[PDB]
């Protein structure tokens, strides 16, 4: 079903240690289940606990990706819905760990890990920020190589041995019992315990080494299960059928079920892929014909259209060494990845990284460090990838490097930049690139003083996104252009505009939009010294952002509310507000949270209480000394009440 947990079926056969079982289900914290390939780990992760939700790691992993997709499932639960989620589509931090560790704190869902990942410090510290508090509901059991070093604290290390002689005896009479008891004896001189190798000699026949006995057993092996083992060897994720299907040109079932009897290939659901000790041993048989069947891969996710089918084309694009495939690769990024490049920047960079040569992957490296900050190795990008893009992208560098100089206070620059895609997006009719013109355009006018050009170049960028179909964008414009209006000192247009921008939010159920403009929608309403209106609409914006943790404007929030709720409201709410304005002015420091404190006092004094309990006036003008804008806030209280 769509939108699920990937929950693998356990093993047909198995005869589980009870002891490391008793172990795992009984243990505190994490438990680490550590051996070599094959070794029954990710089966024995099954035999624990079977709804427990599963997330097998590839290659490409960004930790951020992990925590959304974790954050997908604890949405799902219901209990880090409203939390965990919509703090992802905000922003990042290391407040990551507090709650997914209260995640599992409230949900109490045991998880299970399987395999090891690149990146693997960033992983690490998250979860020796979850063993130690030891949650007396959630449980978090991974399966690796090798001990991942987290301490003994809370953590309750299991090292598989395989399988003990009677056990594996018993394996052997549990598949074929009339098979004769003294030839088991045997196998244990050949497999010693080991559970994958042993099903490997059950549904085989025919002494040979540990190497040769894994190769003399691949010679077993039919026609198409060494194409398929050949070809499955060169994927890293596992694949649907049809994704197989598609990736032979023709039929993979009879060998896919017939590797499968003999443990080989092992699916997760739906998908399936190769042992990882299966994929060490064939990936080598064949290696000539990886372009033919990574580029058919690649045109079947990009069939899929979904941001992780997107990246998962991304790496094996690399892997075929076609720079024009890149190219076209990149148009469909600004398509569909333009919306989650600041979600997954990380992710994306190891993949860009990998061909820092291309001049095309230097555009989007360049992005990242827009949004890092770093403006000079990205105008430098910017500069060096120059001849080698097409008229297209020759747009699209010149609006970034007009963005680049944005922030360096370098508007003239920025407008040569800009002048030189005036006669790009004309002449090839682009929508998208027309799109990104007059979006840089806005930009580059707003940073002036002048917002009259803006309003006209955020109209006729509408048109463009009224044909693509994306709500994201439309929402995010229509918030915006409800803010030039109101400081042009209108104020119909502004109230208005992101009134049908919530009509949008509302419609296509985006919460953070919804209550971004529910700050848009109480500041205006304080403009026009409305108390209700605009002291309600901050009221659940301050409870969302309190929320989400965005305690920035959490603060914007309850300022403008504690002010025009005691104009014509009780003292009490907006008591409240100052209160907590204090309670996150003392953990972030906030400029405008310490100007809670002395709303406070205004309550104070409001409230028939003493200059002493006025005194919180100067508790934080003390604090607001060194902020001169301090003295601005001062002309909003006074005029009020
Ligand atoms: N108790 C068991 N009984 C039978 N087969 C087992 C048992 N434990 C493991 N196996 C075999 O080993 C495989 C799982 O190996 P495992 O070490 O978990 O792989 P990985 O962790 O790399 O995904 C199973 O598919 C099965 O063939």
Redesign the pocket.
């Known amino acids: 079903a769509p939108i699920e947990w990937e929950s693998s079926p356990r093993?047909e056969?198995?005869?589980?240690?009870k002891r490391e079982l008793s172990i795992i289900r009984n243990a505190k914290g994490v438990v680490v289940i550590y051996?070599?390939?094959?070794?029954?780990?990710?089966?024995?992760?099954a035999?624990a606990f079977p709804n427990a939700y599963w997330y097998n790691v590839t290659g490409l992993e960004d930790f951020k990706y992990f925590a959304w997709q974790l954050g997908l499932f604890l949405s799902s639960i219901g209990f880090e819905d409203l939390l965990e989620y919509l703090r992802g589509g905000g922003n990042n931090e290391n407040d990551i760990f507090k709650l997914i560790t209260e995640g599992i704190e409230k949900t109490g869902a045991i998880i299970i890990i399987?395999?090891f990942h690149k990146f693997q410090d960033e992983k690490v510290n998250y979860l020796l920020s979850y063993l130690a508090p030891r949650i007396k509901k959630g449980k978090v059991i991974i399966?690796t190589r090798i001990r991942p070093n987290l301490g003994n604290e809370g953590v309750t290390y299991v090292n598989?041995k395989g399988?003990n002689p009677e056990?594996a005896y018993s394996?052997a009479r549990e598949k074929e019992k009339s098979m004769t008891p003294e030839e088991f004896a045997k196998l244990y001189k050949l497999t010693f315990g080991?559970?994958?190798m042993?099903?490997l000699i059950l549904e085989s026949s025919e002494d040979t080494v540990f190497n040769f006995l894994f190769e003399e057993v691949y010679q077993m092996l039919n026609e198409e299960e060494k194409d398929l083992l050949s070809i499955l060897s060169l994927f890293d994720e596992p694949i649907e059928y049809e994704g197989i299907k598609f990736l032979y040109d023709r039929n993979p079932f009879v060998p896919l079920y017939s590797l499968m009897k003999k443990?080989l290939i092992?699916k997760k659901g739906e998908k399936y892929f190769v042992?990882?000790?299966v994929r060490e041993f064939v990936r080598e048989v064949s290696n000539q014909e990886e372009k033919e069947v990574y580029l058919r891969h690649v045109n079947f996710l990009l069939k899929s259209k979904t941001p992780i089918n997107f990246l998962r084309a991304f790496k094996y694009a690399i892997k075929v060494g076609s720079s024009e495939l890149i190219r076209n690769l990149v148009e469909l990024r600004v398509k569909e990845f333009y919306r989650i490049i600041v979600d997954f920047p990380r992710m994306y960079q190891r993949l860009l990284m990998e061909v820092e040569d291309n001049p095309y992957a230097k555009i989007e490296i360049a992005i990242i460090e827009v949004q890092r900050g770093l403006f000079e190795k990205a105008i430098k990008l910017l500069k060096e990838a120059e001849p080698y893009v097409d008229e297209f992208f020759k747009c699209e560098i010149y609006s970034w490097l007009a963005d680049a100089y944005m922030e360096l206070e370098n508007l003239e620059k920025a407008e040569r930049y800009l002048k030189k895609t005036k006669e790009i997006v004309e002449k090839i009719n682009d929508m998208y690139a027309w799109f990104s013109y007059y979006a840089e355009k806005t930009k580059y006018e707003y940073y002036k003083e002048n917002s009259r050009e803006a309003l006209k170049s955020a109209l006729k960028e509408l048109e463009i996104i009224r044909k693509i179909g994306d709500p994201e964008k439309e929402g995010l414009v229509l918030l915006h252009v409800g803010d030039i209006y109101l400081h042009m000192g209108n104020y119909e247009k502004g109230i208005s505009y992101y009134q049908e921008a919530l009509k949008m939010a509302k419609a296509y159920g985006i919460k953070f939009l919804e209550h971004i403009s529910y700050m848009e929608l109480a500041k205006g309403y304080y403009q026009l010294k409305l108390y209700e209106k605009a002291s309600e609409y901050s009221e659940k914006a301050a409870n969302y952002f309190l929320m989400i943790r965005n305690y920035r404007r959490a603060t914007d929030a309850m300022a403008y509310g504690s002010v025009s709720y005691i104009a014509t409201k009780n003292l009490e709410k907006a008591e409240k507000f100052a209160k907590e304005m204090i309670r996150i002015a003392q953990s972030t420091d906030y400029p405008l949270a310490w100007a809670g404190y002395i709303f406070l006092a205004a309550v104070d004094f409001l409230k028939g209480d003493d200059w002493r309990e006025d005194y919180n006036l100067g508790k934080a003008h003390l604090k607001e000394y060194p902020w001169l804008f301090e003295a601005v806030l001062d002309e909003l209280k006074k005029v009020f009440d």
């Open positions: 093993v056969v198995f005869v589980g240690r051996g070599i390939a094959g070794i029954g780990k990710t089966s024995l992760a035999k399987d395999d399966t598989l399988l056990e394996l080991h559970p994958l042993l099903n443990g092992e042992h990882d000790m």
